[PDB]
């Protein structure tokens, strides 16, 4: 019986190569040409690959998982068996897919019109996002914030209600507690002694690690609030929460756009020499060849010939449509490319190292069998790509490449400016991410009644995130669904886990590189020792459990907040002194309304 | 004088599961056409020297032709245990010849996909050195009989390569020619001048 699974997977692995590569080749043509001709061809090849997974997963369950001894073989059959969630009515699943498509269309096509000038009707991107990121008018931002939740937000309320019912019915039929328990299975390690992990242990570890982030976030909140009181006078209380429409985007997921209002030492020049670095045009090939030499110096292989022949490295002509999201592609059969709408700027140069980090990960685990070609968990890929742009942004690397002036002055004030910009993006999103998943987890678990969704949502915003709603929202609203990841059915805890992982990786690779100064000044270039430690994790794929793959690089079997907190320690001590005459913490009772 | 171009520069090349054999004897071998070429990408001579063989005499040469992907070329060597080396073409541990291979993506790969080249994926036992198997009988991995129809634990033995020009080097079509040298009791029939 153990030999039967071997012959079964040996056909699955080779028939998957066919359908996965054809569905990936067809998917590429749509992203390189948006035309109904390609939209239908892409979907057809994807439908074949989907129907394949239907039958193969049912057949995979017929073999007993526990009757297998080979760990690598047992792990392969499990992935196929766990892929079978076909326990619903053909009509109700058809409606669930209709609900999932309706919410996606409402979110992507939702438009709001300016009440002063109805000629200007704005959708989310671009428009409302430009208002939430650049406007300094309290009322203008309040309009866009409230409109997106009162128009498209309310339309998603009934859909999300039925979305929860159908998703929980699907999960409970697969021996899951709820749909939240379903998503949490990506971290579950059932088997291998000493390396296990449960679908509830994540909840405990996420809340534990978040408790150590509270002091750092409380001081970033206090510093931002004080700076925002000067920007929006008479609108913010020195002891209350921050109004949601003043956080830099539609939801407050990132405080990146608040840097202009919260810059510590604005008189120092910014290291983003994008304008003058455009004059150093070079070419798109030079940008990615520089990214290539980064990984080559660390001991990783060069980019494949298919990358230089089959990838979108610029923007061809005008008669050819192209989607502009940056993506790295591992289509299979050795086909590696990157598609990204990039010019000769500098912020994409960091993302170029990020996306090429995804390719290096995809290249390394290609030796593993088909079912095992994936990151250790959902957070492993993004953490790998983030440390590349993390090292490629240091002044030392920029000096040695010939991009920054050879005599740049690194004061202790320019160090705070950079770290503060990082904290607004990296640390500001941690309470937002955890609180959002904490709300969805409790809703799926049936702990939040339907008549208390928005009441519990904003009760947690004021306590966990320290953000108060500007206008009261009754149960007709559905502000969670006003975010892409919520209404488009995507787990969100991956952004919290990868953020802790990426600093564990960087700390491990910089210690392997024997970095001297602070962690934020580390660049693992020319460090073959750091690459060997990283490569030992990339080559594993999803073969070994995520706890072991994490242990191979950082030395731990679980998340760790210490590397993240040590990265921001120079800023944390500076924030504690800046807030000595302020008020750290917030009252959950103050609101901009009455 | 030896028909080497008829084997290397041959138009159609066979599948690895149904590899072909050509027996060459009584001619004047010019091995300089082979080792003085960037055309070949591998050329690993086991048992003999790739250069010294030009001034050596043998009895007959057996040129074996077939096609495998780039990652399957490393199995065409003495002592290998992959799928090609187990079910398609096994070289003996005492092999005395040269294995030549070169990339043929522009010839053996089409944008629509070249599914012509096939290989045997399942077999009861392994292949003895230089054995061949053309059977298309439904492989039975379980106990329940398979009759002639496919189905549960009943799999067709032959699988086909997918040769598209966007595949990586490891998945691109390579044409392999396994020159097998031997000497019987009569040691001189083909030799270099
Ligand atoms: C059931 O399985 C299918 C198919 O997965 C297959 O089987 C598993 C065991 C693995 O071997 C897979 O390699 C194999 O294809 C699942 O559907 C697909 O799931 C994959 C990912 O699991 C989706 O592809 C990608 O998903 C990434 C998740 O991080 C996305 O991230 C990108 O990463 C690239 C790196 O190159 C970068 O450019 C970016 O960082 C980017 O974020 C990526 O966008 C891409 O979508 C794929 O879309 C899914 N397709 C379908 C048709 O579902 C399915 O989820 C699973 N169901 C379960 C487990 O319940
Ligand atoms: C398969 O076809 C190739 C051509 O595509 C053949 O290569 C040619 O081989 C001949 C000998 O058979 C070479 O001629 C010799 O060239 C040298 C100089 O290199 C010259 O000094 C000699 O006098 C003689 O003319 C020829 O150069 C060579 N050309 C190319 C382009 O390779 C090959 O022989 C054919 N057969 C095989 C590979 O078995
Ligand atoms: C280490 O990395 C640096 C760059 O990060 C490399 O130094 C550059 O090398 C190029 C050509 O090799 C020179 O044109 C540059 O002038 C060098 N930079 C500086 C600042 O001088 C270096 O080659 C890498 N390897 C070693 C061993 O140092
Ligand atoms: C886009 O397509 C170009 C030509 O392909 C053909 O025309 C497009 C409009 C589609 O209908 C496609 O199905 C056709 O086969 C390609 O030359 C080009 O590389 C493609 N990608 C980009 C980014 O231009
Ligand atoms: C990477 O490029 C260098 C320089 O050309 C080369 O020596 C090395 O073999 C290459 N590595 C590959 C292609 O894996
Ligand atoms: Cl919200
Ligand atoms: Zn990425």
């Amino acid at each position: 019986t153990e030999d039967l699974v071997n012959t079964f997977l040996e056909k699955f692995n080779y028939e998957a190569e066919e359908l996965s590569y054809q569905s990936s080749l067809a998917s590429w043509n749509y992203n390189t040409n948006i035309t109904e001709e390609n939209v239908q061809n892409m979907n057809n090849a994807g439908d074949k690959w989907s129907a394949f997974l239907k039958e193969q997963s049912k057949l995979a369950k017929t073999y007993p998982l526990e009757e297998i001894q080979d760990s690598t073989v047992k792990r392969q059959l499990q992935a196929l068996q766990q892929n079978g969630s076909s326990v619903l009515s053909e009509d109700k699943s058809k409606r669930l897919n209709t609900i999932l498509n309706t919410m996606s269309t409402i979110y992507s096509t939702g438009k709001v019109c300016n009440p002063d000038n109805p000629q200007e009707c704005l959708l989310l991107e671009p428009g409302l996002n430009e208002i939430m990121a650049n406007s300094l008018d309290y009322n203008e931002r309040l309009w866009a914030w409230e409109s997106w939740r009162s128009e498209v937000g309310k339309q998603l309320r009934p859909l999300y209600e039925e979305y929860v019912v159908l998703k929980n019915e699907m999960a409970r039929a697969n021996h899951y507690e709820d749909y939240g328990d379903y998503w949490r299975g990506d971290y579950e390690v059932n088997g291998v002694d000493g390396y296990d992990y449960s679908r509830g242990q994540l909840i405990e570890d996420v809340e534990h690690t978040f408790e150590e982030i509270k002091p750092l976030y409380e001081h970033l909140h206090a510093y931002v609030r004080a700076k925002l009181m000067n920007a929006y006078p008479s609108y913010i209380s020195p002891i209350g929460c921050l109004p949601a429409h003043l956080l830099g985007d539609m939801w407050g997921r990132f405080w990146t756009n608040l840097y202009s209002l919260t810059v510590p030492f604005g008189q120092k020049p910014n290291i983003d020499v994008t304008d003058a670095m455009v004059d150093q045009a070079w070419d798109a090939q030079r940008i990615f060849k520089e990214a290539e030499k980064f990984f080559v110096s660390v001991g990783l292989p060069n980019m494949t010939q298919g990358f230089w022949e089959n990838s979108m490295l610029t923007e061809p002509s005008d008669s050819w449509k192209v989607v502009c999201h940056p993506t790295a592609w591992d289509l299979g059969r050795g086909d590696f490319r990157i598609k990204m709408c990039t010019k000769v700027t500098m912020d994409d140069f960091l993302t170029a190292h990020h996306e090429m980090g995804h390719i290096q990960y995809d290249m390394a685990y290609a030796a593993q069998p088909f079912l095992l070609r994936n990151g250790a968990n959902e957070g492993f890929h993004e953490a790998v790509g983030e440390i590349m742009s993390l090292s490629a942004a240091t002044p030392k690397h920029l000096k040695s490449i010939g991009l920054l002036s050879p005599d740049f002055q690194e004061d202790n004030e320019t160090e705070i400016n950079f770290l503060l910009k990082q904290a607004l993006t990296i640390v500001g999103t941690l309470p937002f991410t955890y609180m959002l998943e904490k709300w969805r987890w409790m809703v799926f678990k049936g702990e939040i009644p339907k008549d208390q969704w928005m009441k519990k949502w904003w009760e947690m915003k004021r306590e966990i995130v320290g953000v108060v709603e500007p206008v009261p929202h009754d149960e007709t609203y559905c502000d969670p669904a006003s975010l892409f990841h919520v209404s488009n059915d995507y787990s969100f805890i991956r952004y919290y886990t990868r953020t802790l992982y990426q600093f564990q990786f960087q700390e491990a690779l910089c210690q392997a590189a024997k970095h001297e100064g602070p962690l934020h000044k580390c660049d693992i270039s020319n460090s073959t020792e750091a690459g060997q430690k990283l490569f030992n994790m990339l080559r594993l794929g999803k073969s070994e459990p995520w706890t072991l793959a994490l242990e191979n690089v950082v030395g731990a079997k679980n998340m760790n907040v210490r590397p993240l907190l040590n990265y921001f320690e120079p800023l944390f001590t500076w924030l504690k002194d800046q807030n000595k005459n302020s008020f750290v913490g917030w009252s959950t009772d103050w609101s901009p309304y009455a | 004088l030896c028909p080497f171009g008829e084997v290397f520069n041959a138009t159609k090349f066979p599948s690895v599961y149904a590899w072909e054999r050509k027996k060459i004897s009584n001619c004047v071998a010019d091995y300089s056409v082979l080792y003085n070429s960037t055309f070949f990408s591998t050329f690993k001579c086991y048992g003999v020297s790739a250069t010294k063989l030009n001034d050596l005499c043998f009895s007959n040469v057996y040129a074996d032709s077939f096609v495998v992907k780039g990652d399957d070329v490393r199995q065409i060597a003495p002592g290998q245990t992959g799928v090609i080396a187990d079910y398609n073409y096994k070289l003996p541990d005492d092999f005395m010849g040269c294995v030549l291979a070169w990339n043929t993506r522009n010839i053996d790969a089409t944008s629509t996909g070249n599914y012509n080249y096939k290989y045997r994926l399942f077999r009861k036992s392994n292949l003895k050195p230089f054995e061949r198997d053309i059977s298309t009988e439904i492989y039975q991995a379980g106990s329940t009989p398979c009759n002639g129809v496919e189905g549960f634990n009943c799999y067709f033995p032959l699988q086909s390569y997918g040769f598209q020009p966007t595949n990586g080097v490891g998945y691109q079509p390579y044409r392999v020619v396994v020159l097998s040298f031997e000497l019987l009791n009569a040691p001189a029939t083909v030799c270099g001048p």
Side-chain angles (χ1 to χ4, degrees), chain A residues 295-312:
Chain A
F295 299 102
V296 170
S297 74
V298 194
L300 290 182
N302 324 6
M303 294 296 297
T304 62
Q305 301 170 7
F307 158 78
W308 276 297
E309 301 172 351
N310 316 321
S311 194
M312 269 281 306

mmCIF file of all heavy atoms in Angstrom, chain A residues 295-312:
data_model
loop_
_atom_site.group_PDB
_atom_site.id
_atom_site.type_symbol
_atom_site.label_atom_id
_atom_site.label_comp_id
_atom_site.label_asym_id
_atom_site.label_seq_id
_atom_site.Cartn_x
_atom_site.Cartn_y
_atom_site.Cartn_z
ATOM 1 N N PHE A 295 22.892 38.757 -5.529
ATOM 2 C CA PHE A 295 22.733 37.361 -5.143
ATOM 3 C C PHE A 295 23.959 36.533 -5.506
ATOM 4 O O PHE A 295 24.296 35.585 -4.788
ATOM 5 C CB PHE A 295 21.461 36.778 -5.763
ATOM 6 C CG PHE A 295 20.205 37.476 -5.319
ATOM 7 C CD1 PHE A 295 19.573 38.393 -6.141
ATOM 8 C CD2 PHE A 295 19.653 37.207 -4.079
ATOM 9 C CE1 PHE A 295 18.419 39.034 -5.732
ATOM 10 C CE2 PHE A 295 18.502 37.841 -3.665
ATOM 11 C CZ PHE A 295 17.883 38.754 -4.490
ATOM 12 N N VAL A 296 24.638 36.870 -6.608
ATOM 13 C CA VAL A 296 25.841 36.134 -6.988
ATOM 14 C C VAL A 296 26.950 36.348 -5.966
ATOM 15 O O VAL A 296 27.673 35.409 -5.612
ATOM 16 C CB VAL A 296 26.279 36.494 -8.420
ATOM 17 C CG1 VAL A 296 27.658 35.912 -8.718
ATOM 18 C CG2 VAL A 296 25.265 35.984 -9.430
ATOM 19 N N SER A 297 27.102 37.581 -5.472
ATOM 20 C CA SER A 297 28.127 37.856 -4.469
ATOM 21 C C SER A 297 27.883 37.054 -3.197
ATOM 22 O O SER A 297 28.832 36.620 -2.533
ATOM 23 C CB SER A 297 28.164 39.352 -4.160
ATOM 24 O OG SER A 297 27.054 39.732 -3.364
ATOM 25 N N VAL A 298 26.611 36.849 -2.840
ATOM 26 C CA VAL A 298 26.270 36.081 -1.643
ATOM 27 C C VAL A 298 26.405 34.580 -1.855
ATOM 28 O O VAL A 298 26.366 33.817 -0.881
ATOM 29 C CB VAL A 298 24.887 36.537 -1.136
ATOM 30 C CG1 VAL A 298 24.622 36.038 0.266
ATOM 31 C CG2 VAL A 298 24.802 38.049 -1.150
ATOM 32 N N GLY A 299 26.587 34.133 -3.094
ATOM 33 C CA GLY A 299 26.757 32.726 -3.390
ATOM 34 C C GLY A 299 25.584 32.050 -4.068
ATOM 35 O O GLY A 299 25.573 30.817 -4.157
ATOM 36 N N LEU A 300 24.606 32.805 -4.548
ATOM 37 C CA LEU A 300 23.429 32.269 -5.211
ATOM 38 C C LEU A 300 23.619 32.294 -6.721
ATOM 39 O O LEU A 300 24.429 33.064 -7.244
ATOM 40 C CB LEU A 300 22.199 33.100 -4.825
ATOM 41 C CG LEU A 300 21.746 32.947 -3.370
ATOM 42 C CD1 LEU A 300 20.496 33.771 -3.100
ATOM 43 C CD2 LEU A 300 21.510 31.482 -3.030
ATOM 44 N N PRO A 301 22.889 31.458 -7.459
ATOM 45 C CA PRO A 301 23.143 31.337 -8.898
ATOM 46 C C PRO A 301 22.677 32.563 -9.667
ATOM 47 O O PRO A 301 21.895 33.384 -9.182
ATOM 48 C CB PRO A 301 22.326 30.104 -9.296
ATOM 49 C CG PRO A 301 21.210 30.081 -8.312
ATOM 50 C CD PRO A 301 21.829 30.532 -7.018
ATOM 51 N N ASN A 302 23.182 32.675 -10.893
ATOM 52 C CA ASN A 302 22.752 33.729 -11.794
ATOM 53 C C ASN A 302 21.310 33.486 -12.232
ATOM 54 O O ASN A 302 20.748 32.400 -12.060
ATOM 55 C CB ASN A 302 23.641 33.769 -13.036
ATOM 56 C CG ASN A 302 25.091 33.457 -12.729
ATOM 57 O OD1 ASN A 302 25.440 33.096 -11.605
ATOM 58 N ND2 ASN A 302 25.948 33.591 -13.738
ATOM 59 N N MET A 303 20.709 34.519 -12.813
ATOM 60 C CA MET A 303 19.364 34.390 -13.348
ATOM 61 C C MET A 303 19.386 33.557 -14.625
ATOM 62 O O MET A 303 20.344 33.597 -15.403
ATOM 63 C CB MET A 303 18.774 35.769 -13.629
ATOM 64 C CG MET A 303 18.554 36.606 -12.379
ATOM 65 S SD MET A 303 17.339 35.883 -11.261
ATOM 66 C CE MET A 303 15.874 35.912 -12.288
ATOM 67 N N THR A 304 18.319 32.792 -14.833
ATOM 68 C CA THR A 304 18.243 31.908 -15.987
ATOM 69 C C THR A 304 18.184 32.703 -17.288
ATOM 70 O O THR A 304 17.825 33.883 -17.319
ATOM 71 C CB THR A 304 17.019 30.998 -15.892
ATOM 72 O OG1 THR A 304 15.826 31.794 -15.885
ATOM 73 C CG2 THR A 304 17.075 30.151 -14.632
ATOM 74 N N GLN A 305 18.561 32.029 -18.376
ATOM 75 C CA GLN A 305 18.462 32.632 -19.701
ATOM 76 C C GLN A 305 17.017 32.967 -20.046
ATOM 77 O O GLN A 305 16.747 33.974 -20.711
ATOM 78 C CB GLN A 305 19.072 31.691 -20.738
ATOM 79 C CG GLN A 305 20.529 31.360 -20.461
ATOM 80 C CD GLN A 305 21.057 30.252 -21.348
ATOM 81 O OE1 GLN A 305 20.378 29.800 -22.270
ATOM 82 N NE2 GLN A 305 22.275 29.803 -21.068
ATOM 83 N N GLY A 306 16.074 32.131 -19.605
ATOM 84 C CA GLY A 306 14.667 32.433 -19.804
ATOM 85 C C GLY A 306 14.251 33.746 -19.173
ATOM 86 O O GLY A 306 13.347 34.422 -19.672
ATOM 87 N N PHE A 307 14.894 34.120 -18.065
ATOM 88 C CA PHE A 307 14.634 35.417 -17.447
ATOM 89 C C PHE A 307 14.982 36.561 -18.392
ATOM 90 O O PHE A 307 14.205 37.509 -18.549
ATOM 91 C CB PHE A 307 15.421 35.525 -16.141
ATOM 92 C CG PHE A 307 15.661 36.935 -15.691
ATOM 93 C CD1 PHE A 307 14.665 37.671 -15.079
ATOM 94 C CD2 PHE A 307 16.901 37.524 -15.878
ATOM 95 C CE1 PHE A 307 14.904 38.969 -14.666
ATOM 96 C CE2 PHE A 307 17.143 38.817 -15.467
ATOM 97 C CZ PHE A 307 16.143 39.541 -14.860
ATOM 98 N N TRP A 308 16.145 36.495 -19.036
ATOM 99 C CA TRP A 308 16.526 37.553 -19.963
ATOM 100 C C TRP A 308 15.840 37.457 -21.321
ATOM 101 O O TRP A 308 15.961 38.392 -22.120
ATOM 102 C CB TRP A 308 18.046 37.696 -20.099
ATOM 103 C CG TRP A 308 18.657 38.540 -19.020
ATOM 104 C CD1 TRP A 308 18.416 39.865 -18.796
ATOM 105 C CD2 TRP A 308 19.622 38.137 -18.039
ATOM 106 N NE1 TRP A 308 19.159 40.310 -17.731
ATOM 107 C CE2 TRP A 308 19.909 39.271 -17.249
ATOM 108 C CE3 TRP A 308 20.266 36.932 -17.748
ATOM 109 C CZ2 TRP A 308 20.810 39.232 -16.190
ATOM 110 C CZ3 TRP A 308 21.161 36.897 -16.695
ATOM 111 C CH2 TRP A 308 21.424 38.040 -15.930
ATOM 112 N N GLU A 309 15.135 36.364 -21.607
ATOM 113 C CA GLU A 309 14.455 36.209 -22.885
ATOM 114 C C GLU A 309 12.939 36.298 -22.798
ATOM 115 O O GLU A 309 12.311 36.780 -23.742
ATOM 116 C CB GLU A 309 14.829 34.867 -23.530
ATOM 117 C CG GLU A 309 16.317 34.687 -23.793
ATOM 118 C CD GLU A 309 16.661 33.283 -24.257
ATOM 119 O OE1 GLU A 309 15.771 32.407 -24.217
ATOM 120 O OE2 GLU A 309 17.822 33.055 -24.659
ATOM 121 N N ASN A 310 12.336 35.852 -21.694
ATOM 122 C CA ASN A 310 10.886 35.708 -21.603
ATOM 123 C C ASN A 310 10.238 36.608 -20.555
ATOM 124 O O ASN A 310 9.054 36.419 -20.246
ATOM 125 C CB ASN A 310 10.514 34.246 -21.337
ATOM 126 C CG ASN A 310 11.305 33.278 -22.195
ATOM 127 O OD1 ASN A 310 11.558 33.536 -23.372
ATOM 128 N ND2 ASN A 310 11.707 32.158 -21.605
ATOM 129 N N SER A 311 10.963 37.573 -20.001
ATOM 130 C CA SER A 311 10.457 38.394 -18.910
ATOM 131 C C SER A 311 10.188 39.824 -19.361
ATOM 132 O O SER A 311 10.761 40.318 -20.336
ATOM 133 C CB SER A 311 11.426 38.398 -17.724
ATOM 134 O OG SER A 311 10.807 38.917 -16.560
ATOM 135 N N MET A 312 9.292 40.484 -18.628
ATOM 136 C CA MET A 312 8.937 41.879 -18.874
ATOM 137 C C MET A 312 9.822 42.737 -17.980
ATOM 138 O O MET A 312 9.570 42.875 -16.781
ATOM 139 C CB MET A 312 7.466 42.107 -18.546
ATOM 140 C CG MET A 312 6.522 41.909 -19.712
ATOM 141 S SD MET A 312 6.533 43.347 -20.794
ATOM 142 C CE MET A 312 6.169 44.647 -19.616
#
